[PDB]
Design a protein around this ligand. Structure first.
Ligand code: G6P
Ligand code: ZN
Length: 455
C-alpha cells in the first residue's frame, strides 16, 4: 500500500488512485489486529455519503471479520454517530469510512481502538502490520446496528431550548442531512434546509464550511428568510460553521468563547483545550471565568488524546471541530455542538449577532498557506525552532512556532493534511498586525531566503 495515505490524524487517499478496495480490506485486517491486541474484539463500522462508501466499507468489514472481530455495522451515518456507537456499545473500537470535506473521489478512515483515537505512530503501526504480515486470523461476525435513533434521542432529551428559533441548515449534500435538520426541528426550531439531500457528487458547493465561499448561499438565505441563525456542516458532520442573523461568520475560536463560558459556569476550574490557531482572546476569557486554558496541537485525534490526558471538559479547534465532554462523550461532533449552541442562544433575549459581538474582537488574517514540499515542511519548522529569533514574547513550540505578544500573536506550523506551511496572525491594531507579519516574514527568510512570503 502507498505510504502517503497513512497520515498524522487519520488515513486519507483518492479512490482509484491511492485507495482501492483491496487496500481497505488490509486496513481492516490491520485495525482488527490492533483492536484484538488491546483486548477488544468488538468494532463498530460506519460510512459517510460518498460514492465509494459501499465498495470500500464491505472490504473494511471483511478485513475486520477475517481477524475474528465482531463487527457492529451502523451503516451510513455522520462521523460523530460512529464515535457515539464506539462509546455506548459494549465494544470501544470503531472505524469511520470518510473523506471528510475533500472532493468526491477522496475517502479514508478515522480509527478508534479500545477507546483511543489513533494518531501519528499508531497510524504508521497499521501500515507496518500489513507490510510485516503481523495480522490476526479468525472467523468473526457482523451484526446490524441501527444507532441513529438512540443518538437522536440522547441529544433531544438533554437539550432544553427556552424559546423557538428559525435556523437555516446547510448540509452541503453531505451525510449530515440524515439527522441534522430533523434533530434541530425536534429541539424546537423551524428549519430551512439547504442541500440536505445526501449526494456524493457534491453538485452544489463542497461541504467545507471553513471557506467563506461555501457559506455564501447560507448567508443569503438567512437574510432572505429573516432567520435567527445559519449552520453549515462539513461532509461527515464533525465540523460546524455558524452565521448570525445578520450574516456574520462566527469562526470556531469565538464560538468556543460562548461554549467555554457555558461549560465553566457549571464546572469551576475546568480545563478547556484549543489549538494553536485560535485567538489569544479565548485564552484570557477562559481564565477570567475561572477555567484552565490549555493550548494544544491542531488535529482532531491529537485534541482527543489531550482531552484524555488533561480531563478537559471542552476542546475546540479553528477548523470547526468542537469536542464536548461535559454532558457528552468527548468526541468532536458538529451536530451536537449545533444543539448546544441553540440551547445557549435560545436562553438569551438578544439576537445571535449581539450575543457574539459582545465578546472582544481583534483584527485577524484569513489562514495563510505557503506550498513547500511534503519532505521539507517539517525541516523548515525544525530550522525555525532551532534558529529563529522572535523578539520579546511568549514562544510556544508544541506545534510549529507561535509567539504571543502583548497586542497580538503569530503562528507558523506545518500542515498534516497538505504539503504547506500554515500561518495565522491577529492583533489589536493593523499597525501591530503588520509588525508581527514582518517579524515572521524575516524569520522565514533567515531560514531560507527563497521561501515565498505571500503575506
Ligand atoms: O492544519 P492541518 O494540519 O492541515 O489540519 C487542519 C484540519 O484538518 C482536518 O480537517 C482535521 O480533521 C482537523 O482536525 C484539522 O484541524
Ligand atoms: Zn469532517
Amino acid at each position: 500500500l502507498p505510504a502517503s495515505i497513512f497520515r498524522a490524524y487519520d488515513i486519507r487517499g483518492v479512490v482509484g488512485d491511492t485507495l482501492t478496495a483491496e487496500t481497505a480490506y488490509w486496513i481492516g485486517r490491520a485495525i482488527g489486529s490492533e483492536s484484538l491486541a488491546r483486548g477488544e474484539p468488538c468494532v463498530a463500522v460506519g460510512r459517510d455519503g460518498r460514492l465509494s462508501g459501499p465498495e470500500l466499507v464491505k472490504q473494511l468489514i471483511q478485513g475486520l471479520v477475517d481477524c475474528g472481530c465482531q463487527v457492529s455495522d451502523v451503516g451510513m451515518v455522520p462521523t460523530p454517530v460512529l464515535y457515539y456507537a464506539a462509546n455506548v456499545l459494549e465494544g470501544k473500537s470503531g472505524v469511520m469510512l470518510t473523506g471528510s470535506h475533500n472532493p468526491p473521489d477522496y475517502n479514508g478512515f478515522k480509527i478508534v481502538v479500545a477507546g483511543e483515537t489513533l494518531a501519528n505512530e499508531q497510524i504508521q503501526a497499521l501500515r507496518e502490520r500489513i507490510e510485516k504480515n503481523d495480522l490476526a486470523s479468525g472467523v468473526g461476525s457482523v451484526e446490524q446496528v441501527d444507532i441513529l435513533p438512540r443518538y437522536f434521542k440522547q441529544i433531544r432529551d438533554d437539550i432544553a431550548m427556552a424559546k423557538p428559533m428559525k435556523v437555516v441548515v446547510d448540509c452541503g449534500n453531505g451525510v449530515a442531512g440524515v439527522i441534522a435538520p430533523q434533530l434541530i426541528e425536534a429541539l424546537g426550531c423551524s428549519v430551512i434546509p439547504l442541500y440536505c439531500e445526501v449526494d456524493g457528487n457534491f453538485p452544489n458547493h463542497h461541504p467545507d464550511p471553513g471557506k467563506p465561499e461555501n457559506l455564501k448561499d447560507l448567508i443569503a438565505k438567512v437574510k432572505a428568510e429573516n432567520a435567527d441563525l445559519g449552520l453549515a456542516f462539513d461532509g461527515d458532520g464533525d465540523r460546524v460553521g455558524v452565521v448570525t442573523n445578520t450574516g456574520t461568520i462566527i469562526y470556531p475560536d469565538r464560538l468556543l468563547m460562548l461554549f467555554a463560558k457555558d461549560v465553566v459556569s457549571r464546572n469551576p476550574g475546568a480545563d478547556i483545550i484549543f489549538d494553536v490557531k485560535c485567538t489569544r482572546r479565548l485564552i484570557a476569557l477562559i481564565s477570567g471565568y475561572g477555567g484552565r486554558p490549555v493550548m494544544w496541537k491542531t488535529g482532531h485525534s491529537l485534541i482527543k488524546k489531550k482531552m484524555k490526558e488533561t480531563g478537559a471538559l471542552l476542546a475546540g479547534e479553528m477548523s470547526g471541530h468542537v469536542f464536548f465532554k461535559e454532558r457528552w462523550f468527548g468526541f468532536d461532533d458538529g451536530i451536537y455542538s449545533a444543539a448546544r449552541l441553540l440551547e445557549i442562544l435560545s436562553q438569551d433575549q438578544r439576537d445571535s449577532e449581539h450575543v457574539f459581538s459582545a465578546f472582544p474582537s481583534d483584527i485577524s488574517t484569513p489562514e495563510i498557506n505557503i506550498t513547500v514540499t511534503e519532505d521539507s515542511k517539517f525541516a523548515i519548522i525544525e530550522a525555525l525552532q532551532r534558529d529563529a529569533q522572535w523578539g520579546e514574547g511568549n514562544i510556544t513550540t508544541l506545534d510549529g512556532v507561535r509567539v504571543d505578544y502583548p497586542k497580538g500573536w503569530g503562528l507558523v506550523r506545518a500542515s498534516n493534511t497538505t504539503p504547506v506551511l500554515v500561518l495565522r496572525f491577529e492583533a489589536d491594531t493593523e499597525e501591530e498586525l503588520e509588525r508581527i507579519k514582518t517579524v515572521f516574514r524575516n524569520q522565514l527568510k533567515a531560514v531560507d531566503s527563497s521561501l515565498p512570503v505571500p503575506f
